[PDB]
Amino acid sequence: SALSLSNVAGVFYILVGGLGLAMMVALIEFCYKSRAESKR
Amino acid sequence: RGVQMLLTTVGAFAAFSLMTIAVGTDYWLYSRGVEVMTHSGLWRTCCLEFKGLCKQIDHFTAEYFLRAVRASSIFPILSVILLFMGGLCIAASEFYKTRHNIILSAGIFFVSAGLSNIIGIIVYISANAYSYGWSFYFGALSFIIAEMVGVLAVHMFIDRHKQLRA
Amino acid sequence: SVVLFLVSRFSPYEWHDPPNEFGIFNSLWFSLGAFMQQGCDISPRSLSGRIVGGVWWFFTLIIISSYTANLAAFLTVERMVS
Amino acid sequence: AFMQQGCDISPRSLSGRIVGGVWWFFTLIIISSYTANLAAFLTVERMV
Q1: With contacts defined as CB-CB under 8 Å, which chain C residues touch D37?
Q2: In 10 A of CB A11, how many CB atoms?
Q3: DSSP 3-state assignment of B160?
C-alpha cells in the first residue's frame, strides 16, 4: 500500500528535464553574451 | 586554490571509479530468482545459496521504451562517460592555465553526470518494480561526490573570474 | 540545489557584490523551504533560476499531496477492516 | 510556521536554519496526519 517510485516516476522525469532545460538556457545565454563581448 | 584543485581532482577520480565499479559489479539487488537467493547487477544474475555461474538478465510502447533504456543502461554508462570527460577537462585546465572555460566545462560535466545518475537510478528501480547491495550504494555515493565536485569546480570558475575582475 | 546554484552564480556577465543571493548554502535553504512549503526569504529572478524553482515547486506539490492522500488511505482502510 | 502562514523574518545562520528546518518538517508531518485522520474519521463511521 505504500506508493512506490513507479507511481511518481513521471514527476521525477519532469524535474530532471526541467533542470537540464534550465542549464541549457543559462549556458546559451552565457555563450551569447561571450560572443557579444568578443564583438564589443 | 591548490587545495581546492586537489580536492576537485581526488573527488573526480573517486566518483568516476565508484561509478565504474558499480556498473561493472553485480551486487545491485539481493532478491530471489532462478529458485534461489541471488544477487543481480545491471547485466548478470548469479546465485548465492550452482553457486556462482551467471545468467544474462532477460531484459525483454512506454513499457518497451523503459525496458530498452534499462537494458542498455544508457544513463549509468553516460554518467561514467561524463565523469571521465570532467576529469579530462580538469587535466586540460591544468595544462592551459589561462582558459577558464575548461573549469566551467568540468563543472557542467560533473553536474550532468549526477543528473544522469539520478535518471539511471529511477529507471533501474522502476524496471525492478528484496534489498540493495553495495553496487547500488556505490552509484549513489558517486552521485553525491559528483555533485560536490561540480559545486567545487563552479566555485573555482567563479573565483578565477573574480580574480580577473580585480 | 546544485543546479540552482550553478545557473544563478556561474556567469561572470551577471556579476558585472554578488548578482543575487543564491549561493550553494542559500540554494539549499530556498530548496528546503520550498519542499516544506514554509519558505519566504528570496526568490530566483533569472529565467533559468525560475525554471528550476517552478519545476521543483511542481515536484513538491505532487509529492506532498501524494503523502497526504496515501496516509488518508492507510487510516481509512484500517478503520474499514474487521 | 506551524500555522503554515508567513515568515516576516527567516533564520540565516546554520544552527537557526537547522532549528527552523526540523520545525518545518514537524509542522508538515503533523498537519498531514491531522488532515488524513480527519478524512478517515469522516469517511468511515466506526461506530460504538
Answers
A1: 75
A2: 16
A3: helix
Q: Which residue type is seen at B2? A: G
Beta-carbon contacts below 8 Å between A and B: 24
CB atoms near residue B17 (< 10 Å): 15
What order of strands is seen across the sheet that includes strand B36-40? B54-56, B44-47, B36-40, B29-33, B131-132
Q: Which of C3, C10, C15 is the closest to B104 by Cβ? A: C10
Query: Given the C-alpha cell 506539490, which residue does it identify?
Result: C61
Residue B119: Cβ-neighbour burial (10 angstroms; 0-12, 13-18, 19+):
buried
* D24/C32 touch (CB, cutoff 8 Å), yes or no: yes
CA atoms of C61 and C81, how far apart (whole Å): 30
Closest partner residue to B129 (CB to CB) among A6, A13, A19 is: A6
Cβ neighbours around A18 below 10 Å, total: 20
- Are B131 and B160 contacting, i.e. CB atoms less than 8 angstroms apart? no
How are beta strands B44-47 and B131-132 bridged, if at all?
unpaired
Decide: helix, strand or coil at residue C53. Answer: helix
D8 half-sphere exposure, CB direction, 13 A CA radius: 3
H or E segment at B61?
none
Q: Which residue is it, cell 576537485?
A: B8
Taking an 8 Å cut-off on Cβ atoms, the answer to whether A26 and C48 are in contact is yes
